[PDB]
Design a protein around this ligand. Structure first.
Ligand SMILES: [Hg+2]
Ligand SMILES: [Hg+2]
Lengths: 105, 96, 105, 96
């Protein structure tokens, strides 16, 4: 429970490499910005309808304000694995939320 | 000056396609020259462009005429392929 | 009172032209996207400290997803008048909020 | 690998500058090679670059060491020139 910036990654499906990459992304954030950031992965295949509170922006723009290692993983997710639709960065309270190697639930 | 209605879907279904064609007809016969339907299949083409974005269906669905919203509510609740929408207001840069 | 996308413009000061431009921007939004959008102008000179719920992003990225006439005014605000720091686009409930020719309070 | 601490201020004041220099000293003598102070005056230079952004002071102020946060709380509450902050973690691309 804390108030931080949640990087929302919207993906359609996943591959073994994409899951590995997201876990690495999540690890880099918690290790480098212990609290300034947090990852939340949204798989549109599991939930076609987007929660009203959600919105999806193009990666190129926003991804430029993220740490360098993050821009790298993201670049591989959309360009190489092609599972990435877009993302969002939202300040929000985290605590009635879950924690697992793949970011927040 | 046209309103381009962008519909982001998670693939297609037999009915999903029935709803889309009727929607497109409803804009060509009822709101001629006011809307331009554009469907983007995400489960076919994930990668969002740079000027692109997908907003919440419940919000954009409100400024739309009652019939078009009916189909939208259908694609979101009935079929369940609708991820979200986008609404643009400008001069057509490739209306095909 | 409704739930829409609030384009937040963060500015430092204003000039007669910038105020005119913001009023025009506000008018275009309410007229073209009656409800899909809404403007909120934040003058950092009047409030140096940014409300915790606020964040400011670079214009070039985000401004690309806005209507064309909006990208134009914004371009004149930052490039020509130079009052524009950055912006944000946030979905939020509007109704315990005010209304005046300069967007929301 | 350095943490670049970006401080966006709305101009300066006599004390504001006293606090900044002490802060910069506190990072050069106490956390040598861990932080790199960078101040950006908005009331002097409004225009945000493209890779730039300004986040909420209360959030980023928490991951910072107690003394640096003390000054930050000072520039935000005492002086009142602090608009917000930004925190970067990377290899120095012009540390001057
Ligand atoms: Hg709306
Ligand atoms: Hg935080």
């Amino acid at each position: 429970l804390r108030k931080t910036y949640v990087l929302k990654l919207y993906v359609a499906g996943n591959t073994p490499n994409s899951v590995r990459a997201l876990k690495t992304l999540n690890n880099i954030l918690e290790k480098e910005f212990k609290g300034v950031y947090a990852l939340k992965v949204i798989d549109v295949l599991k939930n076609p309808q987007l929660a009203e509170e959600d919105k999806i922006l193009a990666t190129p723009c926003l991804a430029k304000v993220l740490p360098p290692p993050v821009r790298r993983i993201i670049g591989d997710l959309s360009n190489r694995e092609k599972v990435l639709i877009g993302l969002d960065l939202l300040y929000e309270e985290i605590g009635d939320q879950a924690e697992d190697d793949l970011g927040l639930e």
